[PDB]
Amino acid sequence: DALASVDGNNAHVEGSRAEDGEMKPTVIKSNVTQILRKVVRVSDTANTTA
Amino acid sequence: DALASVDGNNAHVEGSRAEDGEMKPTVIKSNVTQILRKVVRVSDTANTTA
C-alpha cells in the first residue's frame, strides 16, 4: 500500500470543501510453491559385501 | 497335492522385480461304487426233500 504521488501543489481557501479525494487501495502480490523430490533405489544384489 | 518339481535353475537377479510366480492347484481323484448281487431260488419242493 505504497502512498500516493499526488503531492502536487494543493492550495485551497478556508471557506471551501473537498474536491474528490483520491484514496488509493492496496495492491496484492501472490506466489505459488514448488515441489522438490529425491528418490533412492538400492539393489540388495550388489549389496553382498560391506 | 504335490509340491513343485525341483527347479535347479532357481537363479534370480539382484534387486529385481518379484516375478508373478506359479501356483499349481490340487488334483481331485474320484471313484464310484459297484453293486454285488447273488441270487438263489428253490421251488418249495427240493427244500422239503431229505
Side-chain angles (χ1 to χ4, degrees):
Chain A
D1 199 333
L3 300 182
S5 183
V6 304
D7 307 64
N9 46 253
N10 60 332
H12 321 282
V13 306
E14 180 174 348
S16 58
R17 53 181 193 79
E19 307 319 327
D20 183 47
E22 199 168 2
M23 299 144 285
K24 287 284 278 177
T26 58
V27 184
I28 282 159
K29 290 287 179 183
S30 64
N31 204 11
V32 84
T33 66
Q34 181 171 18
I35 310 100
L36 309 169
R37 183 192 293 157
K38 288 291 188 175
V39 202
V40 166
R41 44 102 200 167
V42 307
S43 57
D44 214 329
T45 71
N47 209 24
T48 296
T49 189
Chain B
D1 200 0
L3 306 181
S5 192
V6 282
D7 190 4
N9 197 101
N10 190 346
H12 283 96
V13 191
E14 193 181 18
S16 184
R17 212 198 98 84
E19 202 70 2
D20 51 48
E22 178 167 347
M23 307 128 292
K24 204 61 56 175
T26 189
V27 177
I28 305 103
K29 307 260 62 161
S30 56
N31 199 20
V32 76
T33 48
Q34 172 169 3
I35 313 187
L36 305 173
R37 187 185 295 158
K38 282 293 192 187
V39 186
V40 61
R41 200 164 53 154
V42 176
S43 189
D44 273 349
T45 300
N47 182 283
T48 60
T49 58

